[PDB]
Design a protein around this ligand. Structure first.
Ligand SMILES: NC(=O)[C@]1(c2ccc(F)cc2)CCCNC1
Ligand SMILES: [Zn+2]
Ligand SMILES: [Zn+2]
Ligand SMILES: [Zn+2]
Ligand SMILES: [Zn+2]
Lengths: 69, 69
């Protein structure tokens, strides 16, 4: 039905929100500290000296184990 | 259709996986450091001395800003 299409779009958007904002390919699993923005995979987070959301300096990267993983 | 019901179930399960494992009411937004388990809301994470998943000592809690928030 049309509701099947609506639900498919909601699921796609929720799944896309869990993917890295830089490479768009791998799941988010890393936090920039101390700002707390958790928007990258471990490979993109390792290559950024500044947070891509707020531009704060990245002091270090914390790996996150999320139940959605 | 039956496909609409299957998609509704997938959406519901993904949304439930984003909720605090202790209170089941608030969104997960806190990480236990250094282990990295990100399973609680700020209130529930505040008084735990050890991780409820792996038993590692919690040295501090890092707030996380997730795109799914
Ligand atoms: N000890 C902690 O877990 C907090 C904290 C963490 C790191 C830090 F540099 C200062 C304070 C304190 C307040 C609430 N939870 C966060
Ligand atoms: Zn990436
Ligand atoms: Zn940031
Ligand atoms: Zn809670
Ligand atoms: Zn843990």
């Amino acid at each position: 039905s049309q509701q099947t299409r609506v639900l498919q779009e909601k699921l796609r958007k929720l799944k896309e929100a869990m993917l890295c904002m830089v490479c768009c390919e791998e799941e988010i699993n890393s936090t920039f500290c101390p700002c707390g923005h958790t928007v990258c995979c471990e490979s993109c987070a390792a290559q950024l000296q500044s947070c891509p959301v707020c531009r704060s300096r990245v002091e270090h990267v914390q790996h996150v184990y999320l139940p959605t993983h």
